[PDB]
Amino acid sequence: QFDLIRLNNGTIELNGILTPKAEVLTKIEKTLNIDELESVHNTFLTNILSHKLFATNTSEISVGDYSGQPYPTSL
Amino acid sequence: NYKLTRVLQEAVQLSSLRHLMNSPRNSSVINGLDARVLDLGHGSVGWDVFTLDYILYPPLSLVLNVNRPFGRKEYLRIFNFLWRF
Amino acid sequence: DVPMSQPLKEQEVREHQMKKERFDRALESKLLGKRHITYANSDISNKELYINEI
Amino acid sequence: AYEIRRFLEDVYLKTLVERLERDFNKVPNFSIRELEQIINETEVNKQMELLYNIYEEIFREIEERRTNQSSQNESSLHLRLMVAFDTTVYPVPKGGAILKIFQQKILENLGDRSSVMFLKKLLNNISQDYCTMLYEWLTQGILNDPYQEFMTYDDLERAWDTQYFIRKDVLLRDCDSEEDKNLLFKMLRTGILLKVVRASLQIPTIPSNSSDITIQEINDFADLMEGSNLELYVDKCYSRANEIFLKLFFQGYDLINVLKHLQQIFLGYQSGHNVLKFLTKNMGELTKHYRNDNNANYDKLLQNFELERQSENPNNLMRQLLMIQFDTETLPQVLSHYLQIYPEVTPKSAIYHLKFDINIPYPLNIIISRTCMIKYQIILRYQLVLQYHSRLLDETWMDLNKTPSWKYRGYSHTVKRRIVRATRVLHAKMNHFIKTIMEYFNQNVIDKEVYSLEKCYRNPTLAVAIQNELEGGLTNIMTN
């Protein structure tokens, strides 16, 4: 349940507020909506194209030493 | 001058006052037991210099007259006389 | 009759507490302090009663 | 101003018309002297003189605050309070700065029971909304302050690292003696804890059944400010706030478990095997280069750590949040910023620069402040240095009893002594010293403070008491 935010400087932190462990004082699925489903699909496709053996055509690429090239170009 | 506090804790532990120091409520009674080092000049001996005291804070310092900073210091001189014995 | 010394147990307790307090104050100072001082740079106004010139 | 206008309309103009004009139109024998007599008898002159005196006092106040522009408490630091004082002296008095004027007037009118009754009814009328705001801040932590009046206010209009301020100018008590500061900070802490409780549960208000200590509304401000009445009122509010806050943390957040995991991470408590594992997997890097060499590729260290964290328990929020870091300052130089020690007298081994930290999530950063987190971090760095040298001497004993080159019986029966026997004797002395220092530390300081803290949250009563025990334990450790 702990949705963590991780930053490029290595610093991480919980996203928002820590909810209590179902604390009760007084006395139904959790599904995904349309924008959430499209975000899930786009996240899948990005995660696949963000993988190092797919990332091409940008400056954010880390290059493989002993070739000096981006891995997908080599492959 | 700094082993004396440990000596006091141990003496309270090695005496009938240990039922008071190790009490769940009345430990504060012995919390006020402190020692004082007199000033009788050079060449003195700890026997005629060491004296016991009792550090009272309000509300009790208002009710119990102990060796107040400007009184007669009755407890101190009585303690000296009995310290001789 | 004599210039006796301050209490002993109380004296050493105070010394220990002063060590702890000095440590805590240095720690706070290193953390830019938990309390500071301010002056107010801006004031409210209401769009029902708005102004621009005299 | 509303009371002034209601006085005029309902008393001054009523007197004027229904007496003066009706006698000027219908009553023979009326005259100017009888006009002044009628004015004096209906008390309209006395009550209007009172209102005008209050107006003149407010006017002199405004004038002072307009001309006196040449102007510029440790308890807020003795407590874990990210709160500042707002020493701004506003152009017009607000709230408490005017209720104080009214109380001063009631004092200056002592003996004129009619003037005292008038001024007391004026105060009870004016301060009703202030009592409402104070009641809300004391029972629900809500700050609805659109006119910048209340004693305290939130900054920042993600949004959880809120900082409170205290408007010194609008305070009800001057905050000079010790009991006034105690009361002021008790009010502030009551509001803060109630806001935390209300923000965690994502609710807009705290139900009145959440505690057995129920608070009534302030229906007489003059009585509340009479004497110790305000102290008891704030005491009840503080008791209810602490009860609810401690219920919430110790049940909905399992703060005992969070402290247990923090002591497992930073103290080593019941977690020696994890530290040993970390060292064995990372024994080579923490001694390399005696430093970070030209921003050395110590990213492999972070990768090892994240790999281990991937195999860590998921329900352990603290180890999920543990961030291994390489600080550019050695442990002694970090300690020199608080204690009377002396720095190195050259690069020095990488474990001396290694450190850890956790961005404690809201609300858990209310009790587990950044000060106790820095204490945890320094303690963990020291414990890591000790356990690291102990692992060094362990693996040294291993190489001295597993390499046949050292077990070999020989060496001229002279070289054997002056080399191997002296080596083993010095190594044994080093091992005994290191292990004894670590034993003393761990089971006479660290264990003592863990046990004290464990004693504290056995049915506690105040959140500030738990914070005080935690910080006192870590201070007893850091000042050891």
XYZ file of C-alpha atoms in Angstrom:
694
model
C 0.000 0.000 0.000
C 2.954 2.352 0.577
C 3.069 4.466 -2.585
C 6.625 5.816 -2.517
C 7.934 8.712 -4.594
C 11.534 8.304 -5.738
C 13.562 11.201 -7.124
C 16.576 11.289 -9.430
C 18.779 12.426 -6.512
C 17.996 9.152 -4.715
C 15.789 10.871 -2.124
C 12.487 9.067 -1.567
C 9.382 9.763 0.501
C 5.820 8.568 0.942
C 3.240 10.036 -1.436
C 0.995 12.371 0.532
C -0.174 11.286 3.979
C 0.257 7.989 5.791
C -3.202 6.553 6.316
C -3.965 4.816 9.617
C -4.285 1.035 9.764
C -8.073 1.025 9.336
C -8.590 2.892 12.597
C -12.263 2.812 13.598
C -14.233 5.004 16.009
C -17.852 4.628 14.856
C -20.211 2.081 13.325
C -17.345 -2.755 -2.482
C -14.263 -3.072 -4.677
C -11.747 -0.311 -5.379
C -11.582 -0.428 -9.173
C -10.181 1.881 -11.852
C -11.997 4.500 -13.912
C -11.543 5.511 -17.549
C -8.597 7.884 -17.205
C -7.057 5.401 -14.773
C -7.361 2.535 -17.263
C -5.801 4.645 -20.012
C -3.040 5.654 -17.601
C -2.441 1.976 -16.829
C -2.150 1.125 -20.529
C 0.118 4.092 -21.265
C 2.219 3.200 -18.214
C 2.596 -0.341 -19.552
C 3.672 0.925 -22.973
C 6.031 3.537 -21.508
C 7.613 1.045 -19.093
C 8.238 -1.138 -22.137
C 9.718 1.691 -24.210
C 11.594 3.178 -21.238
C 13.520 -0.082 -20.766
C 17.189 0.431 -21.600
C 17.119 -1.951 -24.580
C 14.315 0.112 -26.148
C 15.142 3.738 -25.295
C 16.412 5.522 -28.407
C 16.567 8.990 -29.957
C 17.116 11.262 -26.959
C 19.837 12.669 -24.727
C 18.478 10.876 -21.639
C 20.068 7.642 -22.926
C 22.965 6.137 -21.049
C 25.521 4.790 -23.510
C 27.320 1.485 -23.209
C 31.047 1.889 -22.721
C 33.359 -0.152 -24.993
C 30.952 0.801 -27.804
C 30.079 4.400 -26.985
C 26.578 3.843 -28.417
C 23.043 3.374 -27.091
C 22.300 -0.311 -26.544
C 19.393 -0.519 -29.066
C 21.635 0.808 -31.847
C 24.135 -1.961 -31.106
C 21.379 -4.581 -31.014
C 33.203 15.745 46.249
C 31.646 13.623 43.507
C 32.013 10.153 44.965
C 29.897 11.418 47.884
C 26.638 11.310 45.925
C 27.259 7.667 44.994
C 28.180 7.002 48.627
C 24.855 8.538 49.666
C 22.866 6.451 47.180
C 24.652 3.313 48.383
C 24.175 4.122 52.074
C 20.466 4.665 51.443
C 20.530 1.325 49.632
C 22.500 -0.348 52.447
C 20.131 0.876 55.185
C 16.520 0.820 56.362
C 15.887 3.851 54.124
C 16.052 1.501 51.125
C 12.361 0.753 51.675
C 11.796 4.477 51.119
C 14.128 5.019 48.158
C 12.769 1.951 46.338
C 9.153 2.861 47.098
C 6.748 3.462 44.179
C 5.557 6.764 45.673
C 7.829 8.003 48.487
C 11.098 7.973 46.521
C 10.739 11.763 46.295
C 11.284 11.842 50.067
C 14.855 10.613 49.651
C 15.306 12.549 46.402
C 15.924 15.548 48.682
C 18.847 14.001 50.557
C 21.985 15.916 49.592
C 25.362 16.495 51.211
C 27.297 19.705 51.767
C 31.022 20.357 52.138
C 31.875 22.872 54.856
C 34.615 25.498 54.646
C 36.794 25.449 57.772
C 40.003 26.476 55.990
C 43.060 24.574 54.856
C 44.322 21.477 56.632
C 40.822 20.248 57.458
C 39.684 16.621 57.465
C 36.544 15.342 55.769
C 35.274 14.205 59.162
C 34.857 17.737 60.543
C 33.802 19.094 57.130
C 31.279 16.645 55.657
C 27.684 17.279 56.699
C 24.315 16.062 55.488
C 21.475 18.315 54.397
C 18.016 18.127 52.863
C 17.107 20.122 49.762
C 13.479 21.169 50.094
C 11.595 22.828 47.251
C 8.090 24.296 47.381
C 5.547 23.639 48.731
C 7.547 22.035 51.538
C 10.328 24.631 51.747
C 7.565 27.010 52.879
C 6.467 24.737 55.756
C 9.618 22.948 56.940
C 12.401 25.219 58.183
C 15.611 23.489 57.103
C 19.026 25.056 56.582
C 17.682 28.125 54.818
C 20.265 30.402 53.170
C 20.009 33.047 55.918
C 18.546 31.338 58.995
C 20.228 29.941 62.082
C 20.929 26.624 60.287
C 19.597 24.578 63.197
C 19.757 21.231 61.392
C 23.377 21.842 60.362
C 24.725 22.593 63.838
C 22.669 19.818 65.438
C 24.103 17.476 62.808
C 27.616 18.646 63.680
C 27.091 17.996 67.386
C 25.733 14.504 66.712
C 28.457 13.928 64.102
C 30.991 14.219 66.903
C 29.307 11.309 68.713
C 29.020 30.194 60.721
C 30.938 29.009 57.651
C 30.693 29.410 53.849
C 29.531 25.873 53.131
C 29.188 24.523 49.612
C 26.082 24.121 47.469
C 24.393 20.679 47.445
C 26.390 17.913 45.792
C 23.819 15.580 44.238
C 21.927 18.632 42.975
C 25.149 20.164 41.639
C 26.084 17.083 39.617
C 22.513 16.620 38.379
C 22.600 20.237 37.191
C 25.917 19.624 35.429
C 24.522 16.597 33.587
C 21.339 18.463 32.649
C 23.429 21.395 31.416
C 25.481 19.059 29.226
C 22.267 17.650 27.752
C 20.802 21.131 27.264
C 23.941 22.444 25.554
C 23.851 19.447 23.216
C 20.185 20.041 22.405
C 20.722 23.768 21.810
C 23.636 23.092 19.463
C 21.469 20.545 17.646
C 18.640 23.062 17.240
C 21.003 25.808 16.055
C 22.361 23.386 13.453
C 18.759 22.875 12.289
C 18.235 26.627 11.669
C 16.323 26.679 14.953
C 12.665 25.627 15.511
C 11.553 29.234 16.344
C 12.428 32.449 14.461
C 11.095 36.062 14.065
C 8.972 37.725 11.297
C 7.371 40.913 9.891
C 4.249 40.904 7.603
C 5.002 41.796 3.923
C 1.381 41.874 2.502
C -2.267 42.835 3.393
C -5.743 41.498 2.377
C -8.276 43.253 0.104
C -11.744 42.214 -1.171
C -12.912 42.074 -4.849
C -16.323 43.432 -3.721
C -14.572 46.727 -2.679
C -11.540 46.857 -5.043
C -9.141 49.844 -5.589
C -6.420 50.986 -8.078
C -5.777 54.815 -7.742
C -6.747 57.985 -5.718
C -18.532 49.053 15.825
C -21.765 47.062 15.647
C -22.287 47.579 19.377
C -21.556 51.295 18.942
C -24.126 51.618 16.162
C -26.695 49.592 18.092
C -26.093 51.796 21.125
C -26.651 54.918 19.047
C -29.753 53.662 17.221
C -31.461 51.899 20.138
C -30.416 54.061 23.118
C -29.032 57.441 22.091
C -31.538 58.175 19.330
C -34.345 56.580 21.343
C -33.564 58.866 24.272
C -33.127 61.854 21.950
C -36.449 61.474 20.173
C -38.804 59.869 22.674
C -37.661 62.117 25.529
C -35.994 65.305 24.314
C -38.011 65.942 21.163
C -41.276 64.758 22.696
C -40.735 67.138 25.618
C -39.715 69.942 23.256
C -42.963 69.392 21.370
C -45.437 68.416 24.112
C -44.115 69.271 27.598
C -44.370 72.847 28.901
C -41.852 73.903 31.563
C -39.147 72.143 29.536
C -35.818 73.955 29.323
C -32.124 73.523 28.595
C -31.287 72.706 32.205
C -34.008 70.059 32.169
C -32.559 68.833 28.876
C -29.186 68.258 30.529
C -30.924 66.716 33.539
C -32.759 64.232 31.301
C -29.473 63.403 29.573
C -27.751 62.793 32.915
C -30.611 60.731 34.358
C -30.954 58.236 31.495
C -27.217 57.421 31.833
C -26.847 58.157 28.114
C -24.076 60.628 28.896
C -22.217 58.111 31.065
C -22.534 55.227 28.603
C -21.599 57.419 25.640
C -18.636 58.786 27.597
C -17.571 55.190 28.215
C -17.832 54.330 24.512
C -15.948 57.513 23.616
C -13.200 56.727 26.119
C -12.816 53.284 24.554
C -12.740 54.882 21.102
C -10.079 57.349 22.247
C -7.993 54.538 23.722
C -8.215 52.616 20.445
C -7.268 55.840 18.649
C -4.180 56.479 20.770
C -3.262 52.831 20.174
C -3.609 53.277 16.407
C -1.507 56.441 16.600
C 1.272 54.757 18.582
C 1.334 51.818 16.171
C 1.470 54.264 13.257
C 4.358 56.283 14.718
C 6.280 53.639 16.714
C 7.896 52.016 13.686
C 11.396 52.074 15.214
C 10.778 48.678 16.836
C 12.669 45.431 16.269
C 10.781 32.228 24.114
C 13.013 29.162 24.476
C 10.094 26.912 25.477
C 9.203 26.538 21.782
C 12.698 25.049 21.374
C 12.707 23.094 24.641
C 9.707 21.434 22.987
C 9.623 19.885 19.517
C 7.655 22.719 17.943
C 8.232 23.993 14.403
C 6.543 27.247 15.406
C 7.797 30.828 15.213
C 6.743 34.099 16.800
C 5.212 36.726 14.531
C 6.424 39.887 16.268
C 4.605 42.111 13.766
C 2.995 45.139 15.403
C -0.078 45.685 13.261
C -1.397 49.153 12.351
C -4.635 48.582 14.292
C -5.094 46.372 17.375
C -6.960 43.123 16.810
C -8.553 40.512 19.023
C -6.701 40.155 22.297
C -5.126 43.591 21.912
C -8.640 45.054 22.201
C -10.069 42.640 24.749
C -7.134 43.772 26.893
C -8.182 47.399 26.394
C -11.693 46.510 27.540
C -10.408 44.638 30.596
C -8.191 47.614 31.437
C -11.252 49.855 31.210
C -13.237 47.572 33.526
C -10.321 47.850 35.951
C -10.161 51.646 35.674
C -13.908 51.770 36.369
C -13.846 49.622 39.514
C -16.378 51.062 41.937
C -18.835 52.424 39.352
C -21.049 49.346 39.245
C -23.105 50.788 36.387
C -20.019 51.480 34.281
C -18.626 48.064 35.196
C -21.867 46.362 34.157
C -21.932 48.302 30.886
C -18.311 47.481 30.057
C -18.757 43.842 31.067
C -21.769 43.458 28.786
C -19.751 45.157 26.046
C -16.904 42.682 26.524
C -19.232 39.672 26.645
C -20.796 40.856 23.389
C -17.591 41.707 21.523
C -15.568 38.648 22.480
C -18.204 36.100 21.427
C -16.704 35.435 17.998
C -13.223 35.315 19.533
C -14.497 32.700 21.977
C -15.901 30.827 18.979
C -12.546 30.847 17.187
C -10.699 29.807 20.342
C -13.187 27.001 21.016
C -12.772 25.731 17.465
C -8.975 25.827 17.681
C -9.117 24.103 21.067
C -11.576 21.304 20.261
C -11.088 20.694 16.520
C -7.850 22.436 15.530
C -9.719 24.439 12.868
C -8.290 27.839 11.934
C -10.942 29.986 10.239
C -9.200 33.363 10.536
C -9.911 35.543 7.490
C -9.081 38.808 9.298
C -5.644 37.835 10.709
C -6.762 37.882 14.346
C -6.192 34.581 16.128
C -3.224 33.836 18.374
C -1.793 31.465 15.767
C -2.094 30.647 12.077
C -0.900 28.192 9.440
C 1.564 29.239 6.779
C 1.353 27.709 3.271
C -2.106 29.272 2.840
C 2.692 17.827 -0.272
C 1.207 20.578 1.916
C 1.864 18.739 5.179
C 5.173 20.226 6.411
C 3.135 23.096 7.832
C 4.733 25.726 10.059
C 2.696 27.573 12.673
C 3.323 31.122 13.815
C 2.095 33.047 16.848
C 0.950 36.652 16.467
C 2.482 38.154 19.593
C 0.457 41.354 19.184
C -3.008 39.756 19.421
C -2.310 37.544 22.434
C -4.648 37.517 25.420
C -1.844 37.176 27.987
C 1.412 39.072 27.622
C 3.535 35.879 27.572
C 6.208 37.105 29.994
C 6.063 34.834 33.048
C 6.402 31.062 32.994
C 2.784 30.059 33.604
C 1.567 32.338 30.818
C 4.015 30.718 28.394
C 2.953 27.286 29.638
C -0.689 28.145 28.935
C 0.081 29.698 25.541
C 2.065 26.700 24.342
C -0.532 24.317 25.770
C -3.169 26.044 23.636
C -0.906 25.895 20.585
C -0.116 22.209 21.098
C -3.768 21.328 21.694
C -4.697 22.886 18.374
C -1.751 21.286 16.576
C -2.505 17.778 17.845
C -6.195 18.100 17.020
C -5.393 19.298 13.500
C -3.038 16.340 13.048
C -5.711 13.895 14.243
C -8.261 15.520 11.944
C -5.963 15.495 8.911
C -4.872 11.870 9.302
C -8.421 10.457 9.278
C -9.243 12.658 6.239
C -12.267 13.962 8.146
C -13.392 17.616 8.366
C -14.264 17.482 12.079
C -13.669 15.251 15.098
C -16.870 13.663 16.482
C -17.731 14.747 20.009
C -17.858 11.096 21.152
C -14.171 10.464 20.365
C -13.293 11.043 24.037
C -14.810 10.941 27.505
C -13.480 14.447 28.239
C -16.109 16.704 26.660
C -15.541 20.460 26.393
C -18.255 23.087 26.742
C -18.405 26.305 24.760
C -17.020 29.541 26.172
C -20.199 31.480 26.965
C -18.615 34.170 29.184
C -15.242 35.530 28.083
C -14.855 37.827 31.090
C -15.273 34.868 33.443
C -12.904 32.749 31.338
C -10.223 35.443 31.618
C -11.012 36.147 35.284
C -8.410 33.826 36.795
C -7.301 30.199 36.596
C -10.493 29.527 34.605
C -8.625 29.749 31.299
C -5.914 27.459 32.667
C -8.429 24.738 33.536
C -10.269 25.169 30.245
C -7.056 24.760 28.259
C -6.090 21.864 30.539
C -9.294 19.983 29.730
C -8.857 20.712 26.023
C -5.246 19.511 26.214
C -6.251 16.323 28.014
C -8.876 15.538 25.373
C -6.436 16.353 22.571
C -3.683 14.160 24.016
C -6.114 11.302 24.641
C -7.373 11.366 21.053
C -3.903 11.833 19.549
C -2.401 8.964 21.538
C -5.354 6.714 20.731
C -4.883 7.496 17.037
C -1.136 6.916 16.954
C -0.940 3.872 19.226
C -3.836 2.102 17.522
C -4.271 3.286 13.934
C -0.568 3.834 13.272
C 1.008 1.250 15.622
C 3.594 3.764 16.777
C 5.136 1.106 19.016
C 5.966 -0.857 15.866
C 7.282 2.228 14.062
C 9.607 2.973 16.974
C 10.624 -0.692 17.064
C 11.583 -0.566 13.387
C 13.406 2.744 13.841
C 15.395 1.222 16.698
C 16.096 -1.808 14.514
C 17.430 0.473 11.781
C 19.395 3.075 13.729
C 20.096 1.587 17.169
C 20.736 -2.013 16.159
C 18.037 -3.181 18.574
C 17.251 -6.846 17.864
C 18.796 -6.247 14.446
C 22.483 -7.134 14.772
C 22.178 -9.780 12.063
C 20.936 -7.201 9.546
C 23.950 -4.996 10.246
C 26.264 -7.995 9.908
C 24.641 -8.887 6.582
C 25.034 -5.307 5.345
C 28.716 -5.350 6.301
C 29.493 -8.730 4.722
C 27.791 -7.732 1.464
C 29.506 -4.318 1.580
C 32.794 -4.953 3.413
C 35.017 -3.824 0.540
C 33.394 -0.496 -0.353
C 33.203 0.992 3.159
C 37.019 0.910 3.342
C 37.771 1.969 -0.239
C 39.642 5.137 -1.245
C 39.488 6.395 2.364
C 36.924 8.782 0.810
C 34.639 9.438 -2.130
C 37.367 9.665 -4.782
C 36.491 12.087 -7.611
C 32.822 11.267 -7.054
C 33.812 7.604 -7.083
C 31.435 5.012 -8.522
C 29.886 4.311 -5.133
C 26.565 3.961 -6.938
C 27.185 0.207 -6.753
C 26.722 0.613 -2.997
C 23.292 2.165 -3.549
C 22.424 -0.626 -5.995
C 23.368 -3.287 -3.445
C 21.228 -1.485 -0.866
C 18.196 -1.272 -3.157
C 18.642 -4.947 -4.031
C 18.535 -5.835 -0.328
C 15.537 -3.539 0.214
C 13.734 -5.401 -2.574
C 13.998 -8.496 -0.350
C 12.954 -6.581 2.777
C 9.572 -7.010 4.437
C 6.947 -4.881 2.638
C 4.995 -4.055 5.817
C 8.146 -2.420 7.249
C 7.499 1.117 6.052
C 10.725 2.390 7.608
C 13.128 0.106 5.742
C 11.195 0.816 2.551
C 11.973 4.483 3.298
C 15.576 3.968 4.427
C 17.950 5.922 2.186
C 21.643 5.010 2.277
C 23.696 8.164 1.785
C 27.337 9.233 1.678
C 27.822 12.452 3.630
C 30.931 14.497 2.889
C 31.754 14.907 6.598
C 33.311 12.282 8.861
C 31.448 11.082 11.961
C 33.835 12.926 14.345
C 33.493 16.165 12.406
C 29.717 15.697 12.472
C 29.880 15.135 16.243
C 32.043 18.248 16.643
C 29.013 20.385 15.743
C 27.339 19.538 19.069
C 29.936 18.206 21.520
C 33.318 19.298 22.875
C 35.464 16.977 20.767
C 38.327 17.545 18.367
C 38.489 16.673 14.650
C 41.192 14.698 12.876
C 44.736 15.691 13.824
C 43.957 13.021 4.730
C 40.990 10.930 3.604
C 39.567 8.538 6.190
C 37.666 5.293 5.666
C 34.389 5.371 3.735
C 32.269 4.050 6.606
C 33.145 7.226 8.516
C 31.244 9.101 5.780
C 28.406 6.577 5.395
C 25.053 7.566 6.883
C 21.340 6.829 6.729
C 18.124 8.827 6.971
C 14.357 8.498 6.613
C 11.819 11.059 5.413
C 9.362 10.137 8.155
C 5.894 10.461 6.593
C 3.215 12.739 7.947
C 1.861 12.574 10.624
C 4.626 10.381 12.066
C 7.029 13.308 11.727
C 5.134 15.124 14.484
C 6.512 12.879 17.252
C 9.512 11.504 15.333
C 10.950 14.954 14.642
C 14.002 15.796 12.565
C 16.091 16.264 15.716
C 15.513 12.704 16.908
C 16.091 11.565 13.329
C 19.503 13.254 13.299
C 20.222 11.595 16.639
C 19.189 8.212 15.206
C 21.435 8.840 12.199
C 24.538 9.769 14.192
C 23.968 6.864 16.586
C 23.672 4.507 13.616
C 26.874 5.848 12.072
C 28.731 5.235 15.338
C 27.200 1.767 15.740
C 28.186 0.962 12.158
C 31.777 2.024 12.803
C 31.919 -0.192 15.896
C 30.283 -3.214 14.255
C 32.514 -2.667 11.214
C 35.716 -2.875 13.225
C 34.276 -5.863 15.074
C 33.656 -7.563 11.719
C 37.217 -6.645 10.750
C 38.562 -8.411 13.831
C 36.191 -11.339 13.248
C 37.452 -11.918 9.710
C 41.000 -11.353 10.970
C 40.551 -14.142 13.528
C 39.122 -16.170 10.645
C 42.207 -15.634 8.480
C 44.452 -16.339 11.474
C 42.794 -19.700 12.150
C 41.878 -20.827 8.609
C 45.069 -20.010 6.711
C 47.540 -22.881 7.295
C 50.342 -20.331 6.870
C 49.446 -19.035 10.350
C 48.555 -22.339 12.047
C 51.878 -23.805 10.873
C 54.108 -24.930 13.745
C 57.665 -23.770 13.106
C 59.301 -20.392 12.455
C 62.686 -21.138 14.062
C 60.935 -21.354 17.476
C 61.911 -17.673 17.739
C 60.247 -16.106 14.705
C 57.059 -17.914 15.735
C 56.881 -15.939 18.974
C 58.080 -12.490 17.896
C 55.812 -12.581 14.818
C 52.843 -14.917 15.169
C 52.477 -14.966 18.949
C 52.833 -11.195 19.276
C 50.361 -10.834 16.402
C 47.798 -13.132 18.019
C 48.246 -11.456 21.411
C 47.790 -7.947 20.025
C 44.828 -9.159 17.965
C 43.290 -10.724 21.071
C 43.736 -7.482 23.011
C 42.217 -5.486 20.137
C 39.299 -7.918 19.932
C 38.668 -7.793 23.671
C 38.795 -3.982 23.681
C 36.481 -3.550 20.683
C 33.988 -6.185 21.825
C 33.987 -4.767 25.360
C 33.411 -1.203 24.173
C 30.562 -2.451 21.990
C 29.133 -4.519 24.855
C 29.252 -1.566 27.250
C 27.654 0.792 24.732
C 24.948 -1.560 23.458
C 23.802 -3.098 26.738
C 24.427 -0.194 29.134
C 23.376 2.879 27.117
C 21.412 1.791 24.056
C 19.571 -0.972 25.913
C 18.907 1.327 28.878
C 17.332 3.988 26.669
C 15.314 1.450 24.667
C 13.989 0.081 27.961
C 13.186 3.572 29.251
C 11.272 4.460 26.080
C 9.478 1.102 26.276
C 8.500 2.031 29.831
C 7.206 5.389 28.596
C 4.519 4.147 26.197
C 3.174 1.677 28.766
C -0.077 3.617 29.188
C 1.198 7.167 28.580
C -0.808 10.366 28.879
C 0.845 13.071 26.736
C 2.275 13.104 23.225
C 4.806 15.663 24.424
C 5.775 13.198 27.160
C 6.537 10.533 24.557
C 8.519 13.015 22.461
C 10.388 14.057 25.605
C 11.266 10.473 26.518
C 12.442 9.719 22.977
C 14.628 12.806 22.730
C 15.931 12.338 26.270
C 16.935 8.781 25.468
C 18.738 9.856 22.312
C 20.408 12.686 24.237
C 21.537 10.356 27.022
C 23.070 8.296 24.224
C 24.673 11.190 22.336
C 26.012 12.785 25.531
C 27.264 9.448 26.875
